[PDB]
Amino acid sequence: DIGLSVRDWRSISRICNIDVTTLTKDASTGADLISMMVDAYYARDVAMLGDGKEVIYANKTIHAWLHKQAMNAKNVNLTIEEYGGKKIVSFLGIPIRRVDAILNTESAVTA
Amino acid sequence: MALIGQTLPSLLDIYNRTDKNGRIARIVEQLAKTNDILTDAIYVPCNDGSKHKTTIRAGIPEPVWRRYNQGVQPTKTQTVPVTDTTGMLYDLGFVDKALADRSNNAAAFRVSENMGKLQGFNNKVARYSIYGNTDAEPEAFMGLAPRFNTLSTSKAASAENVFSAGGSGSTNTSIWFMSWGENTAHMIYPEGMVAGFQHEDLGDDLVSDGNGGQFRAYRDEFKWDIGLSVRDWRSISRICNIDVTTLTKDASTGADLISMMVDAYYARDVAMLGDGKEVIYANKTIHAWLHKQAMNAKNVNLTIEEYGGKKIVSFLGIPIRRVDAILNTESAVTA
Amino acid sequence: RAGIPEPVWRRYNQGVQPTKTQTVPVTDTTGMLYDLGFVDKALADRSNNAAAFRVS
Amino acid sequence: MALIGQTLPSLLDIYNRTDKNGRIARIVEQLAKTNDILTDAIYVPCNDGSKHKTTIRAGIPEPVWRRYNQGVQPTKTQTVPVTDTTGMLYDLGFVDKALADRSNNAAAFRVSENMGKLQGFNNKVARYSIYGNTDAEPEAFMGLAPRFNTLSTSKAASAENVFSAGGSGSTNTSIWFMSWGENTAHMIYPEGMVAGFQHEDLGDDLVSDGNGGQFRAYRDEFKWDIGLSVRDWRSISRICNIDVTTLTKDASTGADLISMMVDAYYARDVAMLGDGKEVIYANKTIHAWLHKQAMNAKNVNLTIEEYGGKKIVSFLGIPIRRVDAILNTESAVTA
Amino acid sequence: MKTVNMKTGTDSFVGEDGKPETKDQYPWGLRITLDNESLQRLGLNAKSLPAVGDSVSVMAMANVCSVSTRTTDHGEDNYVELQITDIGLAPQKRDDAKELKDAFYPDGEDD
Amino acid sequence: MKTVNMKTGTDSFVGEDGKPETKDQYPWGLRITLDNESLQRLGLNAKSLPAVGDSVSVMAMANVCSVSTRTTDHGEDNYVELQITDIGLAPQKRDDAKELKDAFYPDGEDD
Amino acid sequence: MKTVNMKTGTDSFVGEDGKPETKDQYPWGLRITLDNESLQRLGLNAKSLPAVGDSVSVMAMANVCSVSTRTTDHGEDNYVELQITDIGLAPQKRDDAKELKDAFYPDGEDD
């Protein structure tokens, strides 16, 4: 038996998207990419101090999608020789985990 | 039938804070919605009993070219006093000795009260640290407002931006940064909050006037006195910036940008050397936005593995902290 | 916690009204799940060693 | 008679308290010309700081016979909580701190006022131990009102009389049978009159003011808080009756019977097996009349009681006490 | 119990409601757990019903309401989600009665 | 949570009586303290209102009240005093939908 | 700063006197040193003037005075020796302007 706990809400941070096709245009390009991740990160902390750690979730597919899209943004990026980037498992450098989220929530952000 | 907007803790509070499975307090404790701010300042007591005088000067003119014999005349440098005022502010809470004991033990109750009162207090003090000054006193800041010079001193300390509108005050926020050591003055007692005291007596009840009263209670209060200094008009920086149209357009683009971030920094030194520390202030939103936009500079960066740039706390370096400004004010900049 | 206003400045006497702080609970429930398992006590020993079976 | 209601014990007390030419102030002590009644009873603390939330049982069938090896079918039991809460009352006392000193002593005013005002307080608590429901709260007892069942459960406490005059401003009374063990609940914060406490020191204040800020005084406050309970209902039994007319008709003969008293000792009994105290309640005018109709002829008061010590009560052999349940109510609770 | 909030009486006369007067029960909150109350003594004739509403400081928005008929002494129960203002009660209606309304807060019950 | 009693579908169908269903809430007791529940979601058309009732296993006395408007997701709250049998819900009335669910007590909260 | 002495409002209607208000200001003393103050918000047009006075309770002697034209926020300074009462200020005269009024006591200048 289980039941989640809000306790205090501000730790949560959610994102609607995409649908993988907008992330195809950013395959390496920089128009609508995923960098709004940064936004989400800077939307939490008060504090609200605690509780010890954090973690970010992926659905597989979007994980690797994020990798391939990230290694080639028109901006910073050094990567000597060679690619495709030491895994990812960072940013910043809070570990990411993978979940079994459904691949279709339709829009359902605002009906 | 009840008539009034409830001063004092009606039972609704004691039943929301409540106690179930016992107990004493709320699982340390209750949390959430109040924003956070810095300052976190430096404090000083000021001669004399108020004010603080100091002087500065208003121009030092002027020598003239001697033509071998005649023109000289005595010359005279002048000055002027300055320093300003301040004021106190405080609240106080009341309970009913009975209700706070039903259920038992008020200690946790009152502790909750003082912590909450504290967070709201700091919220208000930062809220008025930046605005105000045209009402029943304490205190003054905004007095950099006018856009161009000659009508005031403004100018160099304002750095400024463009855009907004002359007939629509929506919206565009603003950024500040200045140095501490241009202190905050307080009258001769400790610094902030200090409360920190205890009383248990009798009402104090029914108003106007109020056909009686009389009941016992358990109460106290929290006072605070402060007053910033100017000490010098300089080592301060203002901006006008976006608005959200261009603020969104600036993802990596360059029409209405963040460039002023450097100008303001370079608008300082005479000197006027003083004294030890400096710090940049943001209003959140612009914080994260500045991070996200600064990552994509076609020039100095290239990082390693990997992004996204480990916050901002540098530049250059002069550490920056975050406060709570607001997203809507008024124009008044460069010209 | 629900709201936290507000202080007001004193004018060396003018103090008048006290203020307070309020809150509100929220919460929600939980839930449980469980089916059950069965074997045929005889077949668990045919062939022998049922512990590995029930481990699978 | 007109101006106010004599707010403050002024001089008249100090010359009537008194010393009368002692010796020590307050010649120990004074007597109270007020009726008294037995409370008595017992106190318990209750969960959870209010109400008490009870139990009962209500319907628990049924065991079956074992024919063959058949023991088919289970069964279970239900329940339902009940009880009520309490209600607070407290009053404050004032004198002039400068005038407690002829001769110098506090024990006079403090202890005397504590004891006497205790007597008055108790007078009121007994005043409302028998009434109160739709008012400014505490507490409840009239909840035996309906005269037939199904609108509630009457019967077991509804032995009734045959007339009960209720024309105009009248009347009737009742007699009672109860048990205790069904406690009075007080919130976990103690039951005694306490007060007991003197948050005194200073004063603060007069009738605002009268433009005059008052002066030192002596304050005290009293505080009392109780609340009856009915751990069960199958215990109490009352009767409406009569009034004084039809009972005057009996020197000892027939107009209104005295038999139903036995009903009161018989409609009760249910466990209770044990148990503790138990008691019977009459007022005063009903008492001596009961004797007049009982000892003149037929019935026989079986015994007398040298009880506890204390004194005499008689019959049977359960102690009977005296109450201030007065001589005039209404009909309603008739049956 | 208790002062702030409601007190009797109004007193619910012939032909009017009793939305008056409480200003204000405050304007920020929500409500879902504990109890309330309402009852009074002598009536006169026939059908009466209370109600509640709320908004920001004045009027007027959603409601909850209830229905009862003629009797002396009663009481129902609590409330579901609301913003905050609670102008209640708002009693009604017809016949000819001129006495006493109610008040709210803890039990109550019977013995 | 839980069985004992009721379940969806009830289901009011097109636009019906709402007496459903059977087994069981039993007829002897009294209640004044704790909680209840009622809610749903997928609807289509028009005006609704539920009710309760009781007596001796069949007919025909007592109610409380309730009323809802057009949405897809709702819920109010509890009862107070009852005889004891508690038939109901008794929803109604006009237009149709179908599949309009319900499901009637107890425990259960939100947020 | 401060209660005792006076506060705004007074105030200023389309036409006003000015002799009001607020005693206590007290009837005994002399003075030779420090400060006073007076300002407020939104003027309208032209003619205005404060003043002072002194006696015991009423009438009718002495002055110090001042004069200003329309602006938003102003001030002069401190008083001189006095009989002792200072009914002051004693504003005047025309304009319209409902604008609140003024006060006095320690200052408190511009930056």
Side-chain angles (χ1 to χ4, degrees), chain A residues 26-60:
Chain A
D26 70 30
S28 169
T29 78
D32 11 70
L33 60 158
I34 213 174
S35 278
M36 308 81 63
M37 48 191 179
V38 153
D39 145 46
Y41 163 49
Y42 255 23
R44 64 174 252 84
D45 69 317
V46 158
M48 187 90 176
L49 284 166
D51 192 86
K53 38 80 213 65
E54 226 301 56
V55 63
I56 141 175
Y57 288 50
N59 57 25
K60 196 227 307 178

Tab-separated table of all heavy atoms in Angstrom, chain A residues 26-60:
chain	number	residue	atom	x	y	z
A	26	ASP	N	15.148	20.691	-33.879
A	26	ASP	CA	16.322	21.049	-33.095
A	26	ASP	C	17.358	19.935	-33.022
A	26	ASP	O	18.225	19.988	-32.142
A	26	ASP	CB	15.932	21.527	-31.688
A	26	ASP	CG	15.389	20.411	-30.801
A	26	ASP	OD1	15.769	19.235	-30.951
A	26	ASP	OD2	14.576	20.719	-29.919
A	27	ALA	N	17.264	18.927	-33.902
A	27	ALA	CA	18.167	17.778	-33.945
A	27	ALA	C	19.574	18.183	-33.531
A	27	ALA	O	20.191	17.552	-32.666
A	27	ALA	CB	18.188	17.163	-35.347
A	28	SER	N	20.067	19.257	-34.145
A	28	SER	CA	21.168	20.040	-33.616
A	28	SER	C	20.855	21.526	-33.543
A	28	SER	O	21.631	22.272	-32.938
A	28	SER	CB	22.429	19.855	-34.470
A	28	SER	OG	23.417	20.804	-34.111
A	29	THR	N	19.742	21.974	-34.118
A	29	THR	CA	19.486	23.392	-34.309
A	29	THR	C	18.967	24.035	-33.021
A	29	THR	O	18.665	23.365	-32.030
A	29	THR	CB	18.509	23.602	-35.464
A	29	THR	OG1	17.176	23.313	-35.027
A	29	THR	CG2	18.871	22.692	-36.630
A	30	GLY	N	18.867	25.364	-33.045
A	30	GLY	CA	18.499	26.113	-31.862
A	30	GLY	C	17.347	27.072	-32.063
A	30	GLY	O	17.534	28.292	-32.039
A	31	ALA	N	16.143	26.534	-32.266
A	31	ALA	CA	14.944	27.351	-32.286
A	31	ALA	C	14.097	26.941	-31.094
A	31	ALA	O	14.216	27.553	-30.014
A	31	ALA	CB	14.230	27.262	-33.640
A	32	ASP	N	13.243	25.928	-31.211
A	32	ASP	CA	12.546	25.367	-30.054
A	32	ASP	C	13.300	24.107	-29.643
A	32	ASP	O	13.084	23.026	-30.187
A	32	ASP	CB	11.077	25.076	-30.353
A	32	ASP	CG	10.744	25.184	-31.823
A	32	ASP	OD1	11.185	24.312	-32.600
A	32	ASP	OD2	10.040	26.143	-32.198
A	33	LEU	N	14.219	24.259	-28.692
A	33	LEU	CA	14.938	23.114	-28.156
A	33	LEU	C	14.368	22.719	-26.799
A	33	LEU	O	13.194	22.976	-26.515
A	33	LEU	CB	16.448	23.375	-28.102
A	33	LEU	CG	17.000	24.536	-27.273
A	33	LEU	CD1	18.458	24.267	-26.952
A	33	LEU	CD2	16.872	25.856	-28.015
A	34	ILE	N	15.194	22.099	-25.958
A	34	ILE	CA	14.781	21.649	-24.636
A	34	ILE	C	15.361	22.497	-23.517
A	34	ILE	O	15.063	22.235	-22.342
A	34	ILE	CB	15.082	20.149	-24.419
A	34	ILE	CG1	14.017	19.509	-23.524
A	34	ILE	CG2	16.486	19.945	-23.855
A	34	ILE	CD1	14.147	18.011	-23.384
A	35	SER	N	16.147	23.533	-23.839
A	35	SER	CA	16.854	24.320	-22.829
A	35	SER	C	15.934	24.977	-21.805
A	35	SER	O	16.435	25.500	-20.801
A	35	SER	CB	17.781	25.349	-23.483
A	35	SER	OG	19.013	24.757	-23.866
A	36	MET	N	14.612	24.954	-22.018
A	36	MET	CA	13.682	25.380	-20.979
A	36	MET	C	13.850	24.568	-19.698
A	36	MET	O	13.364	24.991	-18.644
A	36	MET	CB	12.230	25.308	-21.464
A	36	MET	CG	11.956	26.009	-22.783
A	36	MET	SD	12.434	24.958	-24.159
A	36	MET	CE	11.306	23.586	-23.922
A	37	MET	N	14.510	23.407	-19.778
A	37	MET	CA	14.978	22.703	-18.588
A	37	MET	C	15.573	23.674	-17.573
A	37	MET	O	15.170	23.689	-16.403
A	37	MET	CB	16.003	21.640	-19.003
A	37	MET	CG	17.088	22.155	-19.951
A	37	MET	SD	18.112	20.866	-20.684
A	37	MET	CE	19.193	21.849	-21.715
A	38	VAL	N	16.503	24.527	-18.027
A	38	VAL	CA	17.113	25.536	-17.158
A	38	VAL	C	16.038	26.338	-16.437
A	38	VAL	O	16.052	26.461	-15.206
A	38	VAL	CB	18.064	26.442	-17.967
A	38	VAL	CG1	18.193	27.825	-17.326
A	38	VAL	CG2	19.431	25.782	-18.127
A	39	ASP	N	15.076	26.875	-17.197
A	39	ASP	CA	13.953	27.591	-16.599
A	39	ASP	C	13.365	26.795	-15.441
A	39	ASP	O	13.314	27.277	-14.301
A	39	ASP	CB	12.901	27.912	-17.674
A	39	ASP	CG	11.463	27.838	-17.155
A	39	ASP	OD1	11.164	28.368	-16.065
A	39	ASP	OD2	10.614	27.264	-17.869
A	40	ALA	N	12.969	25.548	-15.710
A	40	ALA	CA	12.359	24.719	-14.678
A	40	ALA	C	13.253	24.643	-13.449
A	40	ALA	O	12.794	24.844	-12.316
A	40	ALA	CB	12.071	23.327	-15.240
A	41	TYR	N	14.552	24.407	-13.667
A	41	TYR	CA	15.489	24.336	-12.553
A	41	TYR	C	15.433	25.608	-11.716
A	41	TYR	O	15.305	25.550	-10.489
A	41	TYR	CB	16.911	24.057	-13.054
A	41	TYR	CG	17.982	24.373	-12.024
A	41	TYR	CD1	17.876	23.915	-10.721
A	41	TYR	CD2	19.095	25.136	-12.349
A	41	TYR	CE1	18.838	24.219	-9.767
A	41	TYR	CE2	20.067	25.437	-11.396
A	41	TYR	CZ	19.931	24.976	-10.111
A	41	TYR	OH	20.894	25.276	-9.168
A	42	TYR	N	15.495	26.771	-12.366
A	42	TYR	CA	15.510	28.017	-11.613
A	42	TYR	C	14.134	28.453	-11.135
A	42	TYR	O	13.992	29.588	-10.665
A	42	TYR	CB	16.208	29.130	-12.395
A	42	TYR	CG	17.587	29.420	-11.860
A	42	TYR	CD1	18.278	28.462	-11.139
A	42	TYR	CD2	18.184	30.656	-12.043
A	42	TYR	CE1	19.537	28.719	-10.631
A	42	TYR	CE2	19.440	30.923	-11.541
A	42	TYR	CZ	20.113	29.953	-10.836
A	42	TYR	OH	21.365	30.230	-10.338
A	43	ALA	N	13.131	27.585	-11.231
A	43	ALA	CA	11.815	27.874	-10.682
A	43	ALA	C	11.593	27.236	-9.315
A	43	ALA	O	10.483	27.319	-8.782
A	43	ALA	CB	10.720	27.451	-11.662
A	44	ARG	N	12.620	26.615	-8.730
A	44	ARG	CA	12.495	25.975	-7.426
A	44	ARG	C	13.676	26.338	-6.538
A	44	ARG	O	14.831	26.192	-6.950
A	44	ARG	CB	12.356	24.448	-7.543
A	44	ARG	CG	13.557	23.716	-8.125
A	44	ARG	CD	13.360	22.208	-8.068
A	44	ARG	NE	14.207	21.563	-7.066
A	44	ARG	CZ	13.910	21.460	-5.774
A	44	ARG	NH1	12.783	21.970	-5.302
A	44	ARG	NH2	14.747	20.850	-4.948
A	45	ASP	N	13.356	26.823	-5.329
A	45	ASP	CA	14.233	27.108	-4.189
A	45	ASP	C	13.691	28.327	-3.455
A	45	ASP	O	13.353	29.329	-4.092
A	45	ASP	CB	15.708	27.336	-4.556
A	45	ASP	CG	15.935	28.623	-5.331
A	45	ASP	OD1	15.148	28.924	-6.249
A	45	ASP	OD2	16.912	29.335	-5.024
A	46	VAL	N	13.590	28.263	-2.131
A	46	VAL	CA	13.103	29.421	-1.376
A	46	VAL	C	13.999	29.903	-0.212
A	46	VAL	O	14.529	31.001	-0.297
A	46	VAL	CB	11.584	29.321	-1.004
A	46	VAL	CG1	11.245	30.215	0.178
A	46	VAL	CG2	10.719	29.675	-2.204
A	47	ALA	N	14.221	29.118	0.848
A	47	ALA	CA	13.790	27.738	0.999
A	47	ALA	C	13.113	27.598	2.385
A	47	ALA	O	13.369	28.450	3.233
A	47	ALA	CB	14.989	26.827	0.844
A	48	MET	N	12.263	26.596	2.675
A	48	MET	CA	11.973	25.358	1.928
A	48	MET	C	13.195	24.427	1.966
A	48	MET	O	13.355	23.525	1.146
A	48	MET	CB	11.428	25.627	0.509
A	48	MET	CG	10.955	24.417	-0.280
A	48	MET	SD	9.217	24.019	-0.054
A	48	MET	CE	9.071	22.666	-1.213
A	49	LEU	N	14.048	24.661	2.962
A	49	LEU	CA	15.353	24.015	3.009
A	49	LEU	C	15.215	22.510	3.180
A	49	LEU	O	14.457	22.032	4.030
A	49	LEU	CB	16.191	24.606	4.142
A	49	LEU	CG	16.756	25.992	3.829
A	49	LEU	CD1	17.269	26.678	5.083
A	49	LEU	CD2	17.846	25.900	2.765
A	50	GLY	N	15.957	21.770	2.365
A	50	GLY	CA	15.905	20.324	2.380
A	50	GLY	C	15.764	19.766	0.980
A	50	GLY	O	15.828	20.503	-0.001
A	51	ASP	N	15.590	18.454	0.887
A	51	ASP	CA	15.618	17.591	2.057
A	51	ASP	C	16.939	16.835	2.080
A	51	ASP	O	17.263	16.145	3.048
A	51	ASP	CB	14.440	16.622	2.024
A	51	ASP	CG	14.241	15.904	3.337
A	51	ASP	OD1	13.548	16.456	4.217
A	51	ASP	OD2	14.774	14.786	3.489
A	52	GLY	N	17.701	16.982	0.998
A	52	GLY	CA	18.996	16.342	0.888
A	52	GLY	C	19.473	16.159	-0.539
A	52	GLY	O	20.667	16.295	-0.819
A	53	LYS	N	18.558	15.847	-1.453
A	53	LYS	CA	18.947	15.579	-2.830
A	53	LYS	C	17.760	15.821	-3.747
A	53	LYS	O	16.637	16.068	-3.300
A	53	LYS	CB	19.496	14.156	-2.987
A	53	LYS	CG	18.773	13.111	-2.139
A	53	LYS	CD	17.455	12.659	-2.753
A	53	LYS	CE	16.445	12.317	-1.678
A	53	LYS	NZ	16.074	13.522	-0.889
A	54	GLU	N	18.035	15.753	-5.048
A	54	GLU	CA	17.006	15.833	-6.070
A	54	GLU	C	17.360	14.889	-7.212
A	54	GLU	O	18.448	14.306	-7.258
A	54	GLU	CB	16.796	17.266	-6.582
A	54	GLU	CG	15.326	17.710	-6.688
A	54	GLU	CD	14.470	16.844	-7.609
A	54	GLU	OE1	14.406	15.616	-7.395
A	54	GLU	OE2	13.848	17.388	-8.544
A	55	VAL	N	16.411	14.740	-8.136
A	55	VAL	CA	16.523	13.792	-9.234
A	55	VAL	C	15.483	14.173	-10.280
A	55	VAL	O	14.428	14.725	-9.952
A	55	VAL	CB	16.337	12.342	-8.725
A	55	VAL	CG1	14.940	12.144	-8.137
A	55	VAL	CG2	16.630	11.351	-9.831
A	56	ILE	N	15.792	13.883	-11.540
A	56	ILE	CA	14.950	14.248	-12.674
A	56	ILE	C	14.660	13.000	-13.497
A	56	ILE	O	15.525	12.135	-13.664
A	56	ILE	CB	15.595	15.367	-13.523
A	56	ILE	CG1	15.362	15.131	-15.018
A	56	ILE	CG2	17.069	15.535	-13.170
A	56	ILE	CD1	15.870	16.249	-15.901
A	57	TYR	N	13.433	12.913	-14.006
A	57	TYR	CA	12.888	11.689	-14.574
A	57	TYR	C	12.743	11.816	-16.082
A	57	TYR	O	12.442	12.894	-16.603
A	57	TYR	CB	11.520	11.385	-13.958
A	57	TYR	CG	11.598	10.919	-12.522
A	57	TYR	CD1	12.324	11.631	-11.583
A	57	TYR	CD2	10.963	9.761	-12.110
A	57	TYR	CE1	12.412	11.212	-10.279
A	57	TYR	CE2	11.045	9.334	-10.796
A	57	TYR	CZ	11.774	10.065	-9.887
A	57	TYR	OH	11.866	9.653	-8.576
A	58	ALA	N	12.958	10.702	-16.773
A	58	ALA	CA	12.764	10.601	-18.207
A	58	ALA	C	11.990	9.323	-18.506
A	58	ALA	O	11.807	8.464	-17.643
A	58	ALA	CB	14.103	10.631	-18.958
A	59	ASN	N	11.519	9.225	-19.748
A	59	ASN	CA	10.658	8.144	-20.205
A	59	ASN	C	11.387	7.196	-21.152
A	59	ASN	O	10.760	6.602	-22.031
A	59	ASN	CB	9.436	8.732	-20.912
A	59	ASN	CG	9.817	9.638	-22.083
A	59	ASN	OD1	10.889	9.498	-22.667
A	59	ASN	ND2	8.933	10.568	-22.427
A	60	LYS	N	12.703	7.052	-20.982
A	60	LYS	CA	13.575	6.573	-22.054
A	60	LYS	C	13.530	7.586	-23.193
A	60	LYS	O	13.832	8.761	-22.968
A	60	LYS	CB	13.208	5.152	-22.502
A	60	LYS	CG	14.266	4.434	-23.327
A	60	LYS	CD	13.640	3.789	-24.553
A	60	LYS	CE	12.470	2.898	-24.165
A	60	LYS	NZ	11.825	2.294	-25.359
